[PDB]
Amino acid sequence: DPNSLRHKYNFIADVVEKIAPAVVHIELFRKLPFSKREVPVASGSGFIVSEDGLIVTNAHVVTNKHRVKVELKNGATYEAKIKDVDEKADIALIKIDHQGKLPVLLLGRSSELRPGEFVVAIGSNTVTTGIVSTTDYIQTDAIINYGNAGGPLVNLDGEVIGINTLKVTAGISFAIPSDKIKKFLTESHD
Amino acid sequence: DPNSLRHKYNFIADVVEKIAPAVVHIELFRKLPFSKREVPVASGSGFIVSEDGLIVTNAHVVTNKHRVKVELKNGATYEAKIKDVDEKADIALIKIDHQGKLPVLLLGRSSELRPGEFVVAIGSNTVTTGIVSTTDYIQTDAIINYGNAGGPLVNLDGEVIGINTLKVTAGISFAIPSDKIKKFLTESHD
Amino acid sequence: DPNSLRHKYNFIADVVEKIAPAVVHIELFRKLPFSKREVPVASGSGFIVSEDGLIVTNAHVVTNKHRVKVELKNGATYEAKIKDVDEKADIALIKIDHQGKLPVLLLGRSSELRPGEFVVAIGSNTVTTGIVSTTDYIQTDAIINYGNAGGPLVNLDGEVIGINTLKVTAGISFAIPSDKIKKFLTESHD
């Protein structure tokens, strides 16, 4: 039955299946006090914004300090390189040397978001959904935790319209807008 | 693409765009101890149930005590007047003298709610959504906080079927039913 | 208007109306210290997986210890009998002697769940909804509390794809999968 409710109405499933591949797991490693032996300090999610392997996450998953390894949905790990890390903006860009063209999430214009729009908050995997709760930051219903922090908050078209953050206020989560990411990204390409 | 998921399925956005104008921000002001100088004690949301400017909220946003100012979505502030405040019912009615016909939210019959119905919880702006979790009060999934307390909980037709309240139990929010509001409202018109 | 949003899009209401009858309220009673006088120790939900009145819940609503009474949506109470209680699996099967064929929830294959699928978490009544947050246990957005613990987590077809559990982690609820239930159930029929 394509007249069935499950087929007719799992539009979030449809979005997640489309974006999961471009969402990646990031791990921050620090060196032990007087050792050459590094160990993971921070873990998070990010996503790919370019075929050759540019990746964006927030400044908490990645900070210029440490060493970063990326792991792709498929399960191959990759030493990643830190191209830029704006702390004020809470955004980070890293690059991995992948063999062949990668899958990419396009950015949506977060000024077009309408209050009430469904969005999907996704990481590495773990996915929650909700709506845009306010027209800075984008606020939302959707739970954000360590499973999806750093990862994208997307609209029903599969367009990144935020980065998930762990800031929460009275049940409401906060994400950095894609418009800040657009900005950040163009000012790095300098 | 009107075949796009974002167009096809943002029905909550569609409801919010329709009701936002009739949802208003209320502020309760008290006089300082021995001064003529008043200051805001309480803040909340309400909505309009009549063109000339009758407005309903709960008895926590407004209580016969203080002084109330209303601010409309558009941003004009207005001294509001307290027409009735049932404490047992946790409902309040106030009136503002607006220049011209205002937008109005109709009441739905909250006995018709079916378990599982999507409802939208809205304030001033900030919006959350969920479902009716139980057939007194209407219980629901949707987060209610200071952003939308006092404001309406509506059904997918844009009909007020509750007032948002800050009572919460094991994750579940409570709203005063429109049927109590209908009651309250008719017993005031006395 | 069947072109109305409320008619067009309350698919969760539609599912809940279909499954509510097969969802039941369970109560665990223990004997007072040196008395014949028993009193309720635990309360929960379950559901029916057979016309003659087999019922499943988790091992927390029911444990081989106590005495169990079932109450049906309609409101008739029934002494229930404990047919099997796997503690490691956190599943329990009980049987009630009902007069006539009861309504039954079929099991879906929880390996078919896709991340993002809407599911509905239901008890006795109280209902919450969310999505599958991870491909062991099924994780989800939906609030699970005492209102629906023990009860089924279902997919949009009305197929039980989990049992609701009170385990929670960073906002995310856990349910025992239908595939474990299938397993459990066939190994009991021994």
Curated annotation (Swiss-Prot), chains A, B, C:
Secreted keyword on record: yes
Disulfide bond as UniProt keyword: yes
Any one GO CC term of the record: collagen-containing extracellular matrix
Expression across tissues: Widely expressed, with strongest expression in placenta (at protein level). Secreted by synovial fibroblasts. Up-regulated in osteoarthritis and rheumatoid arthritis synovial fluids and cartilage as compared with non-arthritic (at protein level).
Outcome of swapping S124G: In CADASIL2; partial loss of proteolytic activity
Active site residues per record: H60 (charge relay system), D90 (charge relay system), A149 (charge relay system)
Residues of the site described as Involved in trimer stabilization: Y9, F11, F118
Subcellular location: Cell membrane; Secreted; Cytoplasm, Cytosol
Source superkingdom: Eukaryota
Molecular function (Gene Ontology), one example: molecular function activator activity
Record-level GO BP terms: chorionic trophoblast cell differentiation; negative regulation of BMP signaling pathway; negative regulation of transforming growth factor beta receptor signaling pathway; placenta development; positive regulation of apoptotic process; programmed cell death; proteolysis
Outcome, altering S124R: In CADASIL2; loss of proteolytic activity
Domain notes from UniProt: The IGFBP N-terminal domain mediates interaction with TSC2 substrate.
Family, per entry: Belongs to the peptidase S1C family.
Subunit structure: Forms homotrimers. In the presence of substrate, may form higher-order multimers in a PDZ-independent manner. Interacts with TGF-beta family members, including BMP4, TGFB1, TGFB2, activin A and GDF5.
Name of this chain's protein: Serine protease HTRA1
Range covered out of full length: 161 to 369 of 480
